[PDB]
Amino acid sequence: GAVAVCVRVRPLNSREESLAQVYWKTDNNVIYQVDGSKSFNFDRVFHGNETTKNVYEEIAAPIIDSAIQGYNGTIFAYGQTASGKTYTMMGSEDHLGVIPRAIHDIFQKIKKFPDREFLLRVSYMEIYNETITDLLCGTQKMKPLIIREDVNRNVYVADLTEEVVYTSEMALKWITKGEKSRHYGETKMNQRSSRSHTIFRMILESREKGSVKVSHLNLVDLAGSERAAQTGAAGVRLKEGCNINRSLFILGQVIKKLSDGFINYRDSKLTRILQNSLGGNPKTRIICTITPVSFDETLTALQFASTAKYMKNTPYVNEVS
Ligand SMILES: Nc1ncnc2c1ncn2[C@@H]1O[C@H](COP(=O)(O)OP(=O)(O)NP(=O)(O)O)[C@@H](O)[C@H]1O
Ligand SMILES: [Mg+2]
Ligand code: NA
Ligand code: NA
Ligand code: NA
């Protein structure tokens, strides 16, 4: 249970219906090529009519449980542009994503431990064109942030704000504030493409009401692979795509090296800041989002998700003074 990988297949979108061959079909564990021999097995495959409540309760809720018990937990959404990462991780008021569901779930679950005092604090950062910025601190205080390595060789983002929250409502208002500064852009593939990697973090601390359990819960919505022939991107949008594709290539190389056996975490800000999530001291989950009418991008995503199944994390309960 240190590392687990699932797939989420979305329904077809407006763009795909205006066209498309279905390359992929699924059951709850296997995604297989329609008129070919390729197949991939996962601990869970979600189909197009399964909701983000199903994804949340099966994949994320146990990671929230482990965070309350003092384990670091990280959930990544990975997949091609317009495959469903932001839909799954953030969603909307109409149908909540993993991030807002985790907030409600945390505030409800900590009431089961009245003999424990909880302190919760949130951070929200973006990695855009290999620059790290604080989405919470408001525009006038935004600046490129530095990754440092502390006395225990833990990596951290220097001067990233951490906001104490006492209600679900307060946490959700911080997410809203951060979303205002997040980089989005219009392409032919997604009218609201995520042009950066985003990391929503909760630090959960608890102690007996009478030592302190500390968990970092990192909920990560990656940018997605994209091609100029599909996006019609030019100028800054096209530059963003190049940067995104480069960063995902590096994440795949780090995952491949971990699966085999030194590890090139330093080649991207994303692999450096989440090094502890990739072979380290946390429980990591990967939600691989795919569209079934893609062959090459879906194949790349399934091969990444397959390789990540073999990543060896060694999580333990984090207890300090
Ligand atoms: N499971 C789903 N069910 C229904 N609609 C979905 C689903 N997944 C995605 N969508 C739709 O597809 C749109 C684009 O999905 P979105 O999550 O923004 O893509 P993405 O993977 O985040 N792409 P990008 O940020 O460009 O790399 C959403 O706004 C929804 O309309
Ligand atoms: Mg997105
Ligand atoms: Na097959
Ligand atoms: Na087959
Ligand atoms: Na990027």
Curated annotation (Swiss-Prot):
ATP binds at residues 79-86. It comes from the Eukaryota. Signal peptide: none annotated. Residues 2-311 form the Kinesin motor domain. The C-terminal inhibitory domain is phosphorylated. Phosphorylation relieves autoinhibition of the kinetochore motor. Sumoylated with SUMO2 and SUMO3. The sumoylation mediates the association to the kinetochore. It is found in: Chromosome, Centromere, Kinetochore; Cytoplasm, Cytoskeleton, Spindle; Chromosome, Centromere. Belongs to the TRAFAC class myosin-kinesin ATPase superfamily. Kinesin family. Monomer. Interacts with CENPF. Interacts with BUB1B. Interacts with SEPT7. Interacts with KIF18A. Interacts with PRC1. Interacts with NUF2; this interaction determines kinetochore localization. Interacts with SKAP; this interaction greatly favors SKAP binding to microtubules. Interacts with TRAPPC12. Interacts with CTCF. The protein is composed of a N-terminal kinesin-motor domain involved in the chromosome movements, a long coil-coiled region involved in the homodimerization and an inhibitory C-tail involved in autoinhibition of the N-terminal catalytic part. Microtubule plus-end-directed kinetochore motor which plays an important role in chromosome congression, microtubule-kinetochore conjugation and spindle assembly checkpoint activation. Drives chromosome congression (alignment of chromosomes at the spindle equator resulting in the formation of the metaphase plate) by mediating the lateral sliding of polar chromosomes along spindle microtubules towards the spindle equator and by aiding the establishment and maintenance of connections between kinetochores and spindle microtubules. It is linked to Microcephaly 13, primary, autosomal recessive: A form of microcephaly, a disease defined as a head circumference more than 3 standard deviations below the age-related mean. Brain weight is markedly reduced and the cerebral cortex is disproportionately small. This is Centromere-associated protein E. The gene is CENPE.
